[PDB]
Amino acid sequence: MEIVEYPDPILRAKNKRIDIFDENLKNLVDAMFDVMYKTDMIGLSAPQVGLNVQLMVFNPAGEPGEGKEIVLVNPKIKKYSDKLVPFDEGCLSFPGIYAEVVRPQSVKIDARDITGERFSISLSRLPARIFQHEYDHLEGVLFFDRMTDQVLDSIREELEALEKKYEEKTGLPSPERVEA
Numbered sequence: 001m002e003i004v005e006y007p008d009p010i011l012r013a014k015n016k017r018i019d020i021f022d023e024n025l026k027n028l029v030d031a032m033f034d035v036m037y038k039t040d041m042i043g044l045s046a047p048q049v050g051l052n053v054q055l056m057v058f059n060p061a062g063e064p065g066e067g068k069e070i071v072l073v074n075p076k077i078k079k080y081s082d083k084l085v086p087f088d089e090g091c092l093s094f095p096g097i098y099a100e101v102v103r104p105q106s107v108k109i110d111a112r113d114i115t116g117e118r119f120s121i122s123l124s125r126l127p128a129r130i131f132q133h134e135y136d137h138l139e140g141v142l143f144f145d146r147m148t149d150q151v152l153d154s155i156r157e158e159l160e161a162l163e164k165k166y167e168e169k170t171g172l173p174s175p176e177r178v179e180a
């Protein structure tokens with residue numbers, strides 16, 4: 001598969017809810033985990049692999065045979081804690097960019113598993129961190145949108161650089177610019 005990187009429009013387009021839970025969804029999740037493991041990430045969302053569907057995966061442990069392989073489909077955040085905590089984040093769609101993002105420390109969720117059964121779960125610490133980053137993804141939201149002006153100002157060039165790449169390869173004007 002091929003990894004979708006900023007400022008590709010795929011990461012912004014609305015994503016469709018998954019209504020079919022077959023072996024092709026089982027295989028996609030599997031593949032999504034392999035991409036995650038091979039790229040040394042701890043999570044991954046559908047758009048990042050070129051598929052605009054409401055599907056994500058993550059393993060807090062970040063290592064094969066450790067932690068727990070967690071998968072959520074069509075999730076929805078029922079509540080964000082009032083407490084906001086800072087934490088440094090990276091993103092497979094923005095090769096090389098690391099920064100601080102303030103996010104609520106915990107969260108309550110509603111979602112479906114690899115088969116369709118509706119369920120709820122509450123998250124905290126790192127698991128909550130990963131989920132929110134991915135959930136943002138499922139909603140066309142990228143991590144710099146969450147950063148403060150101060151923090152964004154420190155990655156503008158890296159973002160602009162990426163924008164210059166999209167243009168070099170497509171001869172067209174960057175679909176989105178961080179100048180705007």
Ligand SMILES: CCCCC[C@H](CC(=O)NO)C(=O)N[C@H](C(=O)N1CCC[C@H]1CO)C(C)C
Pocket residue numbers: 040041042043044045048087088089090091092093129130131133134137
């Ligand atoms: C923590 C928020 C969840 C980040 C998920 C991203 C991968 C992802 O892009 N999902 O959409 C990741 O693995 N980035 C990692 C990341 O942000 N990490 C690795 C563990 C520590 C933390 C950085 O403080 C690294 C590999 C760049």
Ligand SMILES: [Zn+2]
Pocket residue numbers: 030031034
């Ligand atoms: Zn596999």
Ligand SMILES: [Zn+2]
Pocket residue numbers: 030033034
């Ligand atoms: Zn695997």
Ligand SMILES: [Zn+2]
Pocket residue numbers: 040062
């Ligand atoms: Zn690693």
Ligand SMILES: [Zn+2]
Pocket residue numbers: 088100
């Ligand atoms: Zn720092």
Ligand SMILES: [Zn+2]
Pocket residue numbers: 090091092093133137
């Ligand atoms: Zn990401």
